[PDB]
Design a protein around this ligand. Structure first.
Ligand SMILES: [Mn+2]
Lengths: 343, 100, 218, 346, 343, 98, 342
DNA sequence: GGATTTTCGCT
DNA sequence: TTCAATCCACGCACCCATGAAGAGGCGGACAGCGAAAATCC
DNA sequence: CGTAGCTGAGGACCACCAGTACTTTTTTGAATTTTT
DNA sequence: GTACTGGTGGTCCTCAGCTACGTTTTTTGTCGCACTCTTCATGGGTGCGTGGATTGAA
């Protein structure tokens, strides 16, 4: 719960946060489930329909601690704090760096380096896992291509180049990607892609996964103090959470497509739940989406290890913590922002 | 005044004590006299000022205090554009041709 | 001489006759009546606060209500609403009860005290009635005002007695020629209850013999 | 409202047959073989009119008589079958004055002067209102000639002395006004052409509406006159035929012209009624129709709520009160507060 | 049930009434109880909560018969009439006669002669009935005086003289009245008349009787259309029914004083029911008043004969029938007003 | 603005599925306004919120079975509303001290 | 627009705020004290230890209703702040206008101009009604010298200058404040605006009102979408939360000092309504607090006319409009901020 | 053949 | 010789349907990406 | 803990059903610190 | 026929308690730019009481 990052991540539902002396007590239906100190904490994030003992609220407000309250899954409910601390300077720095282009180019190249690393290693593991019926040398050649592209992105200096190399990578990815899935390959795959109302079932279910990750990343930004609607690589525009999209593109790897292949394989999803209305639209059936959301929650419960921090956690905390490091970049404690990087 | 207002009355007596059925029956009879009913436990009636004063006096002398409730609403003169009906409980209107 | 006693006039008529001077005329000659809000209030208080058949023998004072009174000097019948007997040595005894006391009449209205006559007049008449029955010395009188919930005492002087005697004579004279009179309407005479028949605008307007020939020229 | 004379309470017309008017406290209830058809508070009524066979419980009539709520019974065509009349009240001054005055022929003339003067003024002024707004229609000069005729006659009527003379002049004015009353069918076909008078059977149209209007106006004038305190069956004019509402006829002689037949002409000219509604039996004179009756009564009760300004009293009052205030302006002349009774000179 | 002088009174309560053919029919819960022809009736008077029948209402109102509905105790409720209403010439005749001395004195003579005859005959009857407890000489002397006084009043022509004779007759009867009581003289003693604030017991009782009788007679007049407030002997003043007081002189003694003396002598009540007042006034108790009313109602059902016409009828119809005769005097074939000369 | 309107409802709860309708109508009509009496609510609303409430409430009820009346007073209701009994209700213009 | 909405005060300790649909309900060990609809509330203030249901905080934060927690003597604690709702260009403009001394000194010029104008004109008004109690002459004196400073403030281009002038307006007015009182001078410990945060009588009211205003203006500004308690004008020093009240410094002197003085002069508060602790702190009685809050709401309800267009406006809208205009200036439609000048 | 131009599905 | 009620225009006090601003999101018209696939030379 | 569904156990409202009844004084009562 | 008093039963409303969950979000190149939604403020009616000119008397 209490990560090395100075936040509290109470996620279990129905856990009453309360106050004993100078420490927080997590009550689990009227017995002392947990006890934590408050001497080195900086912010508290609370999931679940719960409460806080007003004594804890009063003790947190004075000594520069913000109490953020969200629901179980995630949809920024509210924030409690006195004279606001740690938002004005952070947001002003965000806007100042948004004005200039050199730092924006640096951050965007960092993000793209992370994405290409993730995809290349994903292909490496995919060809290692099942070396029976797969084009191993083709995937190796693509791996060398993306290694050179990773070096070039690390050698980038301007935006235009960035957007361009982005487009390129994207086409290449679609191309190779069709040949990746193992089971049910003869079902309903993709030869075409739409960033708009989709055709093919796989593209639509990617769209749904993207929307879920969208809501998650938006809440991830909102819980720390940064904006939503001005981005670094994506240009500013009214109504579009550009920073959200930038982080989406950074994390569109393991967290989205691996879930796609897992749902498609293992015969956990069938073709009876997918439909078609005159334009390729895949109207998700209610049972299909119920199973999808249950599987998403189950996956979120899966334990992994952070590549950078090293601390064991859930999948559901992977975005927020990652986004939180972004804050520690804008506060001057970090030199860069590696999501998945060697350095 | 002599404006012929459309006053509304809401009575709420208690029948869980010694002052039950007698009070409820007497209040119902003394309120139905000056107007028709539109819903169970509510009344509307067209009244001048003197009849309204007599009615309010009679009811405030009839019910027992500290155990009941009685509310009087005075819409005014131009009432025909304020009453709004939705359901299926028709009520006669006495400022119309009124043919049977 | 029952017919001589028959020709008596109600006391409230004498109270009204110190007013618009047609209210009494309408109410006792044409036999008409209406009801405003204030009339309802006054009638309700008079009914509620008065019940016969009961007496209160407290000892400090004896209060009796709804007592009929019949004065012959003024030919006035009425019902006194409050009579208070108070212990005294020089007072006259009351019939049917041992001891001697002094009698004070009290009548209670509704409303703020009136700056002019009206009420006081009626109260004086009260005393005279008792003067013709208990034949004693009634030189005091209390009025019980309800809108302020208090009492005011008014001494009785012989000037008021002459006033009420002459007033009663004229008010009794008006029956001989049943002629309802007229008086300036003023703005006060609005909250009259008999206005629906009183018609103030019909008293100080031009004659019809002008209007009916004027609009007839065309 | 200043004078705020009264308030024009409503009125109940029951048409469905075989009902029964019962009383529950202050409510009038319409029962029909134990089936309840409705109930109305009786403080919001003025008169209750019954059609066909409608019986009344003695308690109901006894309650309605004492609060000047009149009850009337009609068979099919507004006949005078039966009304209700209550007790007498103790206001002997007005009744003694009225009886003594009616015993004196000179005062009879001094009142009938104003009655007929108001009547002829009503006729003339309404004729001129009709002429000046319908240019292209009838001889725009025959109406005018009748107008100065009536202006001539009126001043002479003002100066009458005996009842027979006033009756003669009233008849002259009546014929000289019917002569042009026959001329208004402006916006309807020939079936609404006046062709004289028939008394007991309404053998034609127009009569079948004028009869209804006259009955519904008489039953209002009588109620107003008995409300004010007078007795309504002895008169200042007419031959005193026994047992007829003579004073009601006298007081209606003024608002009949401007309040009933003007209404029928307005009803016809607006084409609110169609000749298909009426029908006829083997002889059957002319009988109106149930939807036709409903339309007549709806238009009547709708017009009875127009607000005017009264000429003499100078107040803004509703149309239906006019037959009341006039009567009130009448029974006070009797106490001498005026000089002579001002008739309605709309 | 009974038809007297072309009128029809239905005195028994709870009997519906309807029309059949051209006849009136009485009913009592679907039981045929009476049939009467309507060829030669003049009015209908009801006493029950009947309601009549609308067929008969229309029939009579068309055939110039008015209906009057009362209550079972005689109070006036309503009057159904058509155009006629009947009483117009009668009321005009009353009003014309009310303002002349000759005719008013004639009718006053008619009333007073009946009064003195009834008083004298009652005195002589009581002398005859009881020997021992009577000063016979005083009563016989007063009887001779009253006979001469009646013969004199028969020839009066001026109002003042008739008023004086009435006063003298009243003085004689009053100075005789006290010894009429033959039981419970302890507190029941008559020593004068004081109508307003009545004093000392029995006086109040007498007053009450008069009131009831007056009201009864009042309703009687309203049955036929006589204007109850314009008298003949008594002069008219607003608020008082002068003609009722004129009429109820002849019926005052035999019908009120006899009733009171019967109550006193038969020990029907005791003085415990009268409360006290400080000035000497006397009032009645609710229980005593109700017993008095019940006794009056029961006595009203006594059945006697009619001295002038002979039909055997109840006491309660005496005030009406007489009143009817009064009406038949004003416009009819009556030579002179017939008093209630009852031995 | 700031109209003090009155809402009364009589829902037939014993025909086929009444209880659900009654519960939903009660909660919906308590969302806006305040409780005064059994089957009598009062609310302090503007025109737009009142129209939205009427549109939301006309669908939860089922017509031809129940009744629902809406009355409106104006801007100076303090002269109009009068109370005599023992069911006090707060007026949402007071200092509101708890 | 936005006709002033109500506000809910809770004092009794150990209650609980809970949500039900759109109603806020108060409980205390499952005892429903009352429920209020939330569509006609503007803010919610709580004393003592009162908790809220996280659904309620989410609802209020989403729908622009401000929750504030307080303790005994208005010691501010735990404001409820929501999220970023959009209009990003307005925030861009406001963030660019800061850290540039020209526009900053223009806005400081207008702010302190409004403050000085209000103080001077209020002092002249008070010496205009009743001249017998005090010395008119000296009062008039102060007037012109403040007028003098007015010309100076308009001929200003540097922020570092104005702070110094602040001290002048902070030392050329205190000398009048002690003479502001009329009645009950001897009882009410009246050492002028000589203040002590740990409380030394009289200033209890001062602090209370200060904090009260601070919350109203903060909510009014956040409704439009900007934060200015430490912004372009006020110093960068943390913990000096006054610029949000400096937007209403123009009012801070007017609407709070005037309220305190009116209560004192109208003899409506008695000296028995206060007390002091053992150590020396000063607190207010509960009945006095209820009286103060009733008076504050009743005053905030009263209706006046705005100088700009004259559309008839209410007092609680005085902060809100001052926020709204600050938007329209940053959109470039006007030339410079028109402050509130009475 | 070779600039090159268009065609063409992704940021 | 000034007068003494009467109508009569007359203003005045709010209400209401609706027509025009800020925040908001919508598709189009150029930006682009690199291949390719010729397109042509 | 807020949002829905589900029962339950009551206090309110009203429509009927049945049983023993049915007449009373006279005088009183408001008004420009608002009265449509 | 009504007005008054008992009793019976069927039908409306609100709290209490138990059971299971809680919320379901079909893209995102940039640039002005013609469109839409939502929400605040006005030139028409519609009264509703009132002083200003008009003359027949004392
Ligand atoms: Mn009294």
């Amino acid at each position: 719960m209490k990560k090395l990052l100075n936040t509290l991540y109470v996620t279990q539902p129905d856990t009453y946060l309360s106050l004993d002396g100078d420490n927080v007590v997590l009550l689990k239906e009227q017995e002392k489930l947990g006890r934590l100190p408050l001497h080195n904490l900086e912010a508290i994030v609370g999931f679940g329909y719960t409460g806080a003992s007003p004594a804890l609220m009063g003790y947190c407000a004075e000594r520069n601690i913000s109490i953020t309250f969200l629901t179980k899954n995630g949809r920024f409910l509210a924030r409690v704090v006195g004279e606001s601390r740690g938002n004005v300077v952070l947001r002003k720095t965000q806007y100042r760096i948004s004005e200039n282009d050199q730092e924006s180019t640096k951050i965007a190249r960092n993000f793209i380096t992370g994405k290409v690393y993730n995809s290349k290693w994903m292909l490496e593991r995919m060809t290692r896992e099942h070396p029976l019926r797969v084009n191993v040398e083709q995937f190796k050649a693509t791996s060398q291509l993306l290694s050179v592209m990773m070096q070039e992105i690390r050698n980038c200096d301007s935006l235009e180049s960035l957007r361009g190399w982005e487009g390129q990578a994207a086409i290449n990815y679609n191309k190779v990607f069709d040949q990746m899935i193992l089971q049910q390959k003869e079902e309903f795959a993709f030869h075409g892609r739409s960033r708009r109302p989709p055709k093919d079932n796989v593209n639509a279910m990617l769209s749904f996964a993207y929307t879920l990750l969208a809501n998650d990343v938006a809440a991830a930004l909102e819980t720390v103090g940064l904006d939503a609607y001005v981005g670094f690589m994506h240009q500013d525009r009214p109504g579009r959470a550009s920073l959200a999209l930038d982080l989406m593109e950074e994390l569109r790897g393991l967290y989205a497509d691996r879930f796609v292949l897992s749902l498609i394989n293992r015969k956990e999803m069938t073709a009876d739940g997918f439909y078609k209305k005159e334009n390729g639209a895949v109207l998700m059936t209610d049972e299909a989406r119920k199973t999808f959301l249950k599987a998403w929650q189950t996956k979120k419960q899966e334990k992994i290890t952070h590549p950078y921090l090293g601390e064991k956690m859930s999948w559901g905390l992977v975005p927020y913590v990652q986004a939180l490091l972004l804050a520690r970049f804008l506060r001057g404690d970090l030199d860069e922002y590696p999501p998945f990087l060697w350095k | 005044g002599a404006g012929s207002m459309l006053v509304l009355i809401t009575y709420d007596v208690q029948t869980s004590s010694m002052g039950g059925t007698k009070r409820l029956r007497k209040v119902a009879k003394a309120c139905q006299n000056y107007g028709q009913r539109v819903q169970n436990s509510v009344f509307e009636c067209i009244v001048d000022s003197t009849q309204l004063t007599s009615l309010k006096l009679e009811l405030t002398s009839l019910i027992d205090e500290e155990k009941d409730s009685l509310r009087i609403y005075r819409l005014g003169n131009n009432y025909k554009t304020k009453v709004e009906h939705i359901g299926a409980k028709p009520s006669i209107d006495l400022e119309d041709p009124l043919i049977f | 001489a029952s017919n001589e006693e028959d020709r008596y006039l109600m006391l409230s008529g004498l109270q009204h006759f110190q007013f618009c001077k047609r209210q009494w005329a309408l109410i006792h000659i044409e036999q008409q009546w209406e009801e405003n809000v204030r009339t309802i209030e006054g009638q309700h208080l008079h009914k509620k606060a008065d019940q016969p058949f009961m007496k209160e023998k407290r000892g400090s004072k004896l209060t009796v209500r709804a007592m009929p009174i019949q004065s012959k000097n003024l030919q006035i019948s009425g019902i006194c609403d409050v009579v208070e007997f108070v212990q005294d040595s020089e007072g006259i005894e009351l019939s049917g009860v041992s001891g001697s006391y002094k009698a004070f009449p009290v009548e209670y209205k509704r409303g703020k005290p009136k700056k002019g006559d009206e009420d006081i007049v009626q109260l004086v008449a009260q005393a005279m009635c008792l003067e013709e029955m208990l034949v004693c010395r009634i030189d005091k009188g209390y009025l019980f005002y309800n809108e302020i919930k208090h009492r005011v005492e008014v001494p009785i002087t012989d000037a008021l007695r002459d006033k009420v005697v002459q007033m009663a004579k004229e008010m009794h004279h008006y029956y001989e020629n049943r002629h309802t009179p007229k008086v300036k309407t003023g703005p006060f005479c609005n909250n009259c209850s008999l206005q629906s028949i009183c018609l103030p605008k019909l008293m100080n307007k031009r004659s019809v013999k002008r209007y009916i020939e004027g609009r007839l020229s065309e």
